[PDB]
Symmetry: D2
Subunit: 396 residues, 4 copies
């Protein structure tokens, strides 16, 4: 059981704003975004130094042309000691949450006391691939492969976009274009309402862009884009005519990063640190790849069981909105009412930098718990390939 | 914390760059190694495997989650948890470490861990098509150079980091060439004595347009040694004064390796016979350009974590990123070469970077069984300034 | 020359000249060329498009335009499938060499009605991947900009034309200031001609399918004159001491131009009213990096072929590949600027390279009419060392 | 043409024709062209390379060849920087239209010594990336094969010329078997000519310097590849099942160049040059693009009428074998017996470097007239887009 293992505390978290594809943060690389989130998270822990960080796990999916070990570049960019252990993690969309699980485990096996974990993604700076230049292609037109499509959005087995599998999800659990559109509208409003109230101000670390004075990106870029008129009238994106999944009710392509700082019980009292939360348990699950959309229906109960906590005891859920239908399907399958789900909006309105989103939603979950005066939270995120990861936190 | 047992391991032949295995993708190599290792364990079904950690560095164009593709191609259940890991050249060993940790915290009873790389199939990148470039010649980036072989800070290839290592600790073109010949001869002796045959799962490549079927059983590189050609070849990274060459460096390669890990409880429940027991591990890191000598920190950290002294180890696998890397670390730890890489190393065998961390552990178990040894240690440096080390006991 | 059958220009037309990636960048080179051909034929009272027997059309950067750009221009303009079509490349002189060949084909009796001219879409010039058939096993590769490679780079020196312009400033002693004042004068002349409607007759406006429809009626570059910015900008090819700038060089541009040529017998048969008579021509060439002053050879040769003295020419068109090219040829030939490019030149109007040779001829006929002149001469240098020139009489 | 100034051929020369990515693939198009020009000039006793005033050179796929391929050919062959140089593109007819334009430039008195011909390096045709200047934000992108785009595809229908060859087989009733047995006969004629040394005079062997032993390329690469059983058993190349056009009975893709040296009557007498042949006339013609296959049935009578020569007076024809079916159809339409056609084999067996073939077949034609003691020859060559060019010569 968890209680036979040492405790792990979150003592801070931070995230960049989430920029739009080729948008506000498109000039920064994935490690520049990662360094920014790590540095801002560490600056929040009173009593802890960046040189105290021993190990880093950082998610990143589309690592092509990012260079050697994205996590190492995030760590050194943030002013961490060159002695820091750094590992990049790829569990597609869940990478940012699995990096946190692996960070927690490294404290629990006793191999570190201070760990930074999270994820980063610069989808704007994902390149195109030329796959056959070494052996040559003697004759015929050839292809420049979009690295986002190939390594981020296509299921490897069926060679099928995730949106076509989200469409399969809509067929599977009975959710219409209208049901997905009105959900999409509601989470955009929740995200806009949070923005208007300043409820992202704590978690977000504004970015200063050089160039005489500086430009500052302080807000997530996608929430303001809501136009309910065009949203309900838009042509569907994956099945012309009878499709239900659209770009407005799907997650966008985005840039962003998020980071949490984990410490062991020894270091927490030895440095007399203020803990923000405790990790109570986690769960990974996986099923048929084309059914990844509902893999949180397995991961979430497994994480609750690991934590020894009931689904009704949870005050707030973060169920990552890869698509609107993903949130609706898992809510129906679990019997979770939407009034406890994605209370400041979700990825459909906020953005989905795929390697970071597992940590982004945990960052937001902590804000939701403080803002709405809850204690227990559960984050669940599906990933292409059939999997999902889930985590259970107690606000301290 | 619960004990972690290795019940089997397997590896592909290591193919040469654009060579015997260049038609196979990294998930194809990885799946091959996984189901080969699982077939060696009687009493364990492939459906018993709950989680997979697989190393892979140059993942571009491999498709979503290389480790998931390795697991599903190997016949594992769609319920398996699959994570791809990149710690550059240490990826295959760090995957095994994460796998053992997952057993130790009680979240899995059967884990497959390892690594794969198809350097033959690493693409080139066009990085500015999305925003465009109005006028000017543009660059196609070689993914091997950018994401595998170039240090991020210095923007210098690994062979220049290895020239630092030579000047830092005092090894000449002669001492590195003599070492390369010794490890080539050690690799050729093992092939002839059949000492790789257990650990290598041969790959069948059937041609069927009237073409003949092909079986790859050997590692492709060891046979290529020519000491006369080796000694007289020109330097590769610094003209005239350089000590590092292509023959005394590791090559680019294709390969995969896997281990099956089980918990103390599952080993008893299913009546499994263990091959080894993981005793401890250690990750370490220092200045990025000095990554060549990071094993000098990782290896003692892994020895200390395991409660085992340096003089107790029967054999070391110190991954030969370059001949000079083995020579430098052998100097700083005080290890005699008579207890290092006893069946050859990556200079002669090949270096599919994502896989080598698990490749040298696989070969290490073959060293201990053949030499009738008890305690083995493997450490592997990685670009960025880090290294990973692991200590096993044969049973 | 006079001892051969006479050749008459019965019409001419040009597109507006669009800026690089500007107002005409959505049209392909054959679409621009077809537009110019159709508009030239529409001006000839008593001649049908079906009477056109043969086409010569210039085009330099033909990559990805498809088979035989000239044939595509011809069919796109509505000419018969019986029409003989040949694409011509003499780099920047292509459009004028095309007209020379068209005249010769009438002179040797093989046609009575010929359309000739040139077209270029520099906006739609592709990038090249040169080594994908045989492969490149390892290393960063390049994507070659087709404009630089096939248009603007001298093959022997592998230096861009701007550096040949600097050779010209050094060889004939023209400072940054002299080049800048020339550039301002030619922009002013182009703007004046524009505003006075003097390009209205020669230009065939282009309608783009719509948003609603957009019509392009004016050359895009002339309005861009800013004298203060032009005098203060940094030099574009040699830092610090350079003299050649983007303002005082020709730009990259899109456009086409065409003339309709007929024999003397066909003029009478169809009772056609000629606009001008071709009196003679000349090509010349010298050292490739000195292509800038090859018109100082080709212009005297064309005048001698035409049996016309230099002083009798009422207006010259000396193509402004750079401001320094006009200055140097005016100096070498002793031609006063008051007789040169009277409605502006390519520094201000634009330089679609395969078309400019025919573009300046169309403009020259307009100049001779507007300024009440009879004899004109067009001269255009080209990458590689060459130049072409042609003498016309306005009737 | 009789009332027009005379034009003499004083020499000709061609490279060996190399297979696609074969014996000559390391040479650029201007390197091949320079070789042919220099070799042709070396044959003229009493004429210097510095006497050449003007050059017309065919070349179709000029992408990445650099400025003015013809100029590069001329300067590479050692001609003066004063030489006037123009590159010509009438697709497959380029090399013969170049010679026509060269003859005209003598006839109008603007030159007395002209070199004309053509060159193609199909091995070194690049691929194109068409949308890098404006960018392409998202999606896989095409790399266009320059051979397919600029050499082999009719611009109107976007149809490969092999498909229009099938239209020819259907239009004129030529079976798979008629095309195959024609192909075998022309391979046999090429082999027989090769073996008897009948190409030795016209071919200029190429010496490739070793980077490694030097390599001399002496013979055309394709004739030896004839395998009659495999030629008859191979699948069709363009229409599965019912197709009649195959790779063996079509022209290959090839590298090579050819050149002729032309002089005026005055210059022939001034330098006391020995003429090889006289150009008697020429003709170009065109029709519906997809019927380019039988455009030589228009060009040949037009060139004969221009020359004042009857079809029956011709001792030998070169009808360029773009496809076997092209030679069969033009022989049928014009009533020309095969025993007068391509007496040393044609492009199906020798190869088809498209910018050079128009000049290559004229060089070979001069060799056939000498070997067979003929006097009057006619070369005709169809070209993509609907055209053809033809030329009549008299051996002196
Ligand atoms: Cl998965
Ligand atoms: Cl590292
Ligand atoms: Cl030239
Ligand atoms: Cl045509
Ligand atoms: Rb701090
Ligand atoms: Rb903040
Ligand atoms: Rb959206
Ligand atoms: Rb088994
Ligand atoms: Rb085996
Ligand atoms: Rb080696
Ligand atoms: Rb008309
Ligand atoms: Rb008329
Ligand atoms: Rb007009
Ligand atoms: Rb300009
Ligand atoms: Rb000679
Ligand atoms: Rb010869
Ligand atoms: Rb053939």
């Amino acid at each position: 059981g968890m209680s036979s293992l040492p405790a792990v505390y979150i003592v801070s978290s931070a995230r960049t704003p989430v920029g739009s594809f080729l948008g506000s943060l498109s000039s920064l690389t994935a490690p520049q975004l990662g360094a920014h989130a790590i540095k801002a998270a560490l600056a929040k822990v009173d009593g802890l130094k960046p040189s105290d960080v021993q190990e880093v796990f950082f998610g990143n999916v589309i690592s092509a042309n990012v260079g050697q070990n994205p996590a190492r570049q995030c760590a050194l960019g943030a002013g961490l000691e060159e002695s820091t252990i750094c590992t990049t993690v790829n569990k597609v969309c869940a990478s940012g949450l699995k990096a946190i699980i692996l960070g927690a485990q490294t404290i629990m096996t006793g191999n570190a006391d201070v760990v930074v974990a999270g994820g980063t993604e610069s989808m704007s700076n994902a390149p195109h691939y030329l796959p056959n230049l070494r052996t040559g292609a003697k004759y015929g037109h050839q292809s420049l492969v979009d690295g986002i499509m190939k390594d981020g959005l296509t299921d490897a087995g069926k060679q099928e976009l995730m949106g076509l599998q989200a469409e399969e999800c809509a067929q599977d659990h009975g959710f219409s274009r209208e049901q997905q559109d009105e959900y999409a509208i509601r989470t955009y409003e929740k995200a806009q309402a949070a923005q208007k109230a300043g409820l992202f101000d704590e978690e977000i670390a504004p970015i200063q862009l050089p160039g005489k004075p500086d430009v500052t990106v302080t807000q997530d870029e996608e929430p303001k884009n809501l136009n309910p008129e065009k949203l309900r009238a838009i042509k569907p994106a994956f099945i012309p005519g009878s499709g239900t999944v659209t770009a407005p009710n799907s997650s966008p392509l985005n840039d962003g990063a998020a980071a949490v700082v984990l410490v062991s019980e020894a270091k927490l009292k030895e440095l007399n640190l203020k803990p923000v939360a405790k990790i109570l348990g986690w769960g990974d699950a996986a099923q048929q790849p084309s059914k990844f959309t509902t893999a949180p229906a397995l991961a979430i109960p497994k994480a609750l069981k690991h934590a020894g906590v009931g689904q009704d005891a949870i005050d707030a859920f973060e169920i990552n909105e890869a698509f609107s239908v993903v949130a609706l399907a898992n809510m129906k399958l679990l019997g979770i009412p939407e009034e406890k789900v994605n209370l400041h909006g979700g990825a459909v309105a906020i953005g989905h930098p795929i390697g970071a989103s597992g940590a982004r939603i945990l960052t937001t979950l902590l804000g939701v718990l403080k803002a709405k005066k809850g204690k227990l939270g559960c984050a669940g995120i599906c990933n292409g390939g059939g999997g999902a990861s889930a985590l259970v936190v107690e606000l301290l």
